[PDB]
Structure formats: C-alpha cells, structure tokens
C-alpha cells in the first residue's frame, strides 16, 4: 500500500485478531493481551460499504429486443446491430475491469491509511513517554499496568501524569 504500514513496517497481521480489523497487543508485568479498536475499524467498514452500495445500484433503463433469435433479421442490418452490440460490449468490459482494478487499489490503500492514523494518533498520545521500535510497537519507558494500557486504548492516557518517570528512564 501507499502508506507502508500494512504489508509494510508492520511485518504481518494477526490471525488471532477475530474481533476487529485493527487493534493493540500490549505487554506488561501481568502478561500480554489483545483487543480491537472499534473506531478505526468502523471507519474502514463504512467506507468499503459505501463503495459496495454504489456498485449494487439498480439501473432503471430498459432495452428492448432489436434482432431475432427464431427468425434471423436481414443480414446487413443484422451485421450493423451485431457490430454495435459488440462495440458496446468492448466498452463495458473495459469499464468493469478498470473500475474493479481502481476500486481494489483504493480499497487496499484505504485500509493501509487508517492503520497509519491509529498508529500516529497513539504515538502522539504517548508524547515523550515512549519511542517507536520501527515495527508498530511503542516501547513504554514507565510501568504500564492493565488499567494503563486500557487508558491508551480508550484515549484517557494522560502523558503528564507519568511524564517524570518515563523521562526518568530515557536518560
């Protein structure tokens, strides 16, 4: 993808992550746990569904029969009719191929971007209390128990409250 997260500096996905598209996997003294972030996941689902809803639109234009399967119409007008229909077919096959290719590129790229926003949001949540390891993890330079991890996930982490210790550990 264009944002070099998914299939990028995060080397792979989590097959045990069955409760969301993106999430946090933390480790502290009580061990490790994994939970999904609802807000980021729902944005992607909402954008992809809008894409789907465009494509499942019913088109209310009627076309009627203009040649004949039981009694073939006159040859010349028939060749013009077949030539036109094949020309139109050439056009719609192109449009279908291109549409899906483009839409797939954007869908993949769209999922990649939303991950990066989650990562960067959290990085700015942690401020000066952590450093990025380059694989999607934040090494936390202070003791962070399960309530502390939970506080980053639901955006109640106050960086100042732990500021003295995290800094106290980085130098």
């Amino acid at each position: 993808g264009l944002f070099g997260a998914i299939a990028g500096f995060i080397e792979n996905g989590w097959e045990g992550l069955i409760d969301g598209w993106y999430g946090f996997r933390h480790q502290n003294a009580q061990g490790e746990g994994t939970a999904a972030d609802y807000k980021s996941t729902q944005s992607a689902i909402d954008q992809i569904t809008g894409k789907l809803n465009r494509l499942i639109e019913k088109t209310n234009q009627q076309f009627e029969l203009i040649d004949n399967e039981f009694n073939e119409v006159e040859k010349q007008i028939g060749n013009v009719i077949n030539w036109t229909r094949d020309s139109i077919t050439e056009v719609w096959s192109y449009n279908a191929e291109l549409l899906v290719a483009m839409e797939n590129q954007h869908t993949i790229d769209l999922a990649d971007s939303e991950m990066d926003k989650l990562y960067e949001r959290v990085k700015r949540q942690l401020r000066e209390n952590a450093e990025e390891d380059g694989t999607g993890c934040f090494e936390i330079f202070h003791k962070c128990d399960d309530d502390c991890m939970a506080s980053i996930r639901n955006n109640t982490y106050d960086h100042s409250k732990y500021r003295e210790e995290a800094m106290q550990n980085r130098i």
């Binding site: 998914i6 992550l17 996997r25 499942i56 019913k58 009627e64 029969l65 039981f70 869908t107 934040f138």
Partner: protein, 314 residues
C-alpha cells in the same frame, strides 16, 4: 504496546492497478453468472403466445384465436409460433413484431367494409375450424363464380379514433395464372393503397412455389399505421385479402423470446432466452442479448472487488 491488523489463513486473490493476484481478506463478485431457468413473471400480466405467432394475432390464423384482443405487460414468443396458416409472409415483418412487443396488447374494431357483386367467404383447408376457414380478421374476396370478372373497386376506412390504426391487407399469389383467373378473372390485377402519408401499389404474381401446408400459392400480408382522422383507401381488382378489423395498441409492454417455462413465483426484470437474471450486481456474463432492466453484459466471467484489507499472514 504494539499496533496491528487482522489476517486469515485462506484469503481471496483480486487484481489492482499495479498487481494481479494480490491476496485480500474478503472480496465479492461483481459479475453475475447465476441464471434462473424460467421466465419470472410474478406481478406481471403475461401472455405466452405459444403456437400463436406474434404477427398472427393481427390476422388471426386458427392457432391465434385466443389472442385476437390480448392484453399484456410481458409478451413471450415461442419457437413453435406461426404467424400464418395459409403460407405467406409479412413485409417488414420485424418492424411490425417490434411494434407489437411494446404495444401492451391490441384492441380490435370493425373497419366497416361492405361488398356487393363478389363472394367474401374464401376458405382453405390450411385454416381449419371444424371445416375449411380463413384468417378470422380478414376476408378472401373472390369473383362470384369461377372465371367471372372481379370489378375494380375502391373501399375506404376513416380512423375515427385517437391513436394510430394498424391496417393489414394481403396479396394472394395463386399457384398458376390459370388458377388466378378461376378465382378473379383474367388480366393484370392491381391493388393501390394510399393515405395522407403513404402510397404503394401491388400486382399479384402467380407461379409455382414449394408446397407449404399442401399449397404452392402464397399470401403477402402488408401493413400501415393510419393516423387519427386520416383515411386509408384500397383500390383493387382481385387477389386482395381485405381487412375486416383494424388493430389499436393498448398501451405499453415488453416482448421476449424464450424456451423456458413461466414462473409466477419469482419476480424479475431482465430476461433472455434461457430464463431470468435476478441480480443486484452491475455486470453479467450470461447473455449479451438480454432485454429488460439488466446488468451490463461483459466478457469477463469474474471480476472480484476487494471488500477488505490486504491479507498478510505469517
């Protein structure tokens, strides 16, 4: 604390602008390939013409007697349909077929021709109704007796209604010049038809043709649309299969050609000869000649749209 995304053990491959066969977590098909092999006609007044040919509903060979004044939203032609009983063919037949498919059905009205000095009860063993008969909406005009002269005559009809009138007449081509005289008397025979926007002349052409239904003689059916308040006038001297009633179009409909059964329990709007395409998908790979409200036909049998992120398992 670490950020991540989901993946699954078996994903689905799709194509993008930069790569073919990229694996994503889930995808969905955009091209419809599933056909339901019936004419889904729920909610729609349907007329299955069966052995009645569509053009026959105007002239009324025996196989079409039940269809002389049909009414429909959906018209189904079948391969066994025949427009004729006495062998013959329509001029500009497909144009007339296309007119009748969108008509919504037909309403017949007497055109009011009366005759004197001729027979009007021409019959044939090819149009049998418990005996020799003819097209129910036409009259085979003959001389009163064998070899008697058919008088040059003119018969006119005024469309007193508010929509165009479909007028059909026929030209009889006898099996030989000798047979043509026995029906209408000798010499060149001519039928002229004129309106406010139409003019064309016809002379019969007796001659041997291959036997179709036992006959080597044939009938040419011709037609025109007569505008409201306009008049059609026929000037003829024989070999003329005269119209008895005019036809008027009821409203609107659509016509299909199928070889599959009617199903009043599925509802559909896109038909082809093999059944009904029921789909919310924007494309179909089933039949490029499908008619109705249809997904656009494409040559690809499958175009997978990614509906999830890239799958990167370990």
């Amino acid at each position: 604390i670490c950020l991540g995304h989901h993946a699954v053990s078996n994903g689905t491959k799709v194509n993008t602008l930069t790569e073919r066969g990229v694996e994503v977590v889930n995808a969905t098909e955009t091209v419809e390939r599933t056909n339901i092999p019936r004419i889904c006609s729920k909610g729609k007044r349907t007329v299955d013409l069966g052995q009645c040919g569509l053009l026959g509903t105007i002239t009324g060979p025996p196989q079409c007697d039940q269809f002389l004044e049909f009414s429909a939203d959906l018209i189904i032609e079948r391969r066994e349909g025949s427009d004729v009983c006495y062998p013959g063919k329509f001029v500009n037949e497909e144009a007339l077929r296309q007119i009748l498919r969108e008509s919504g059905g037909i309403d017949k009205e007497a055109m009011g021709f009366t005759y004197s000095g001729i027979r009007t009860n021409g019959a044939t063993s090819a149009c049998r109704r418990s005996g020799s008969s003819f097209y129910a909406e036409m009259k085979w005009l003959l001389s009163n007796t064998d070899n008697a002269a058919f008088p040059q005559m003119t018969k006119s009809y005024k469309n007193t209604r508010k929509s165009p009138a479909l007028i059909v007449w026929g030209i009889h081509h006898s099996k030989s010049t000798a047979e043509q005289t026995t029906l209408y008397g000798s010499g060149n025979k001519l039928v002229t038809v004129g309106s406010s926007n139409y003019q064309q002349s016809f002379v019969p052409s007796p001659g041997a043709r291959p036997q179709v239904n036992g006959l080597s003689s044939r009938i040419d059916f011709h037609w025109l649309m007569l505008n409201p308040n306009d008049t059609v006038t026929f000037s003829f001297n024989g070999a003329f299969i005269a119209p008895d009633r005019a036809s008027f179009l009821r409203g609107k409909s659509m016509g299909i050609q199928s070889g599959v059964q009617v199903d009043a329990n599925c509802e559909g709007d896109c038909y082809h000869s093999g059944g009904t395409i029921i789909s919310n998908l924007p494309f179909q790979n089933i039949d490029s000649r499908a008619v109705g409200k249809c997904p656009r036909y494409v040559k690809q049998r499958s175009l997978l749209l990614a509906t999830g992120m890239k799958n990167v398992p370990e």
